[PDB]
């Protein structure tokens with residue numbers, strides 16, 4: 702649909718950038734209000750920094766992935782500067798929330814609770830035939846009521862024939878990314894499951910960098926041997942073995958996201 706018909710298009714005047722949350726190479730991120738009262742998050746593209754089509758492809762993707770456990774597209778402004786307006790999450794990114802006094806005080810009970818909400822979010826993605834490709838504590842947002850949601854669908858893709866194969870020279874964060882995706886650039890929902898495994902280490906350690914004291918090559922070198930991440934400090938052994946399922950060598954042997962949710966919920970109530 703063209704902008705004058707798109708239900709997600711709003712006139713820029715309805716918006717009001719109030720507090721800048723981030724500034725990067727490709728644009729900025731603001732906290733603002735829509736029509737005076739509704740708090741929202743605004744992402745603006747830095748004119749010329751990148752393709753407007755590429756910037757907008759994300760919103761277009763979010764129109765297809767609507768769920769309670771996924772950050773929700775609020776609207777767009779398709780004139781320059783382009784805006785992508787989305788649901789506001791009061792407690793910011795998970796990786797940061799876990800480092801605050803509030804986050805620090807969270808029990809393993811609540812840590813498992815949150816892990817289960819993320820997995821439930823990925824289960825919806827899983828079934829709708831999407832992959833995320835960028836799952837990590839940084840890309841999980843936290844609400845004022847301490848609930849978690851999937852965010853940043855920039856790399857996310859729709860899938861027909863099982864897998865999406867990335868460009869030839871594209872590079873991804875090595876620690877969080879499944880071998881087959883690093884090695885062959887082939888992504889499946891099972892690539893996401895592996896990241897979830899890394900995500901659980903981030904949760905249980907309160908946002909610590911996975912594979913402590915290890916460089917990427919040391920990490921690649923250990924995995925190829927059969928090793929996986931050393932049991933993180935203070936980590937229920939149950940949760941650790943779940944981590945291992947996510948880290949099985951063959952993608953098809955790794956669990957579904959639906960199974961993961963179920964498992965974590967049992968871990969949650971049993972405590």
Ligand SMILES: COc1cc(Nc2nc(NC(C)(C)CN)n3cnnc3c2C(N)=O)cc(OC)c1
Pocket residue numbers: 722723730742788789790791792793794842
């Ligand atoms: C400065 O850190 C905060 C971030 C967010 N929330 C968000 N944080 C980041 N992270 C940044 C990059 C702003 C941290 N520098 N995002 C990134 N993209 N969206 C967001 C977002 C949001 N939608 O609410 C909320 C918040 O409460 C006062 C504080």
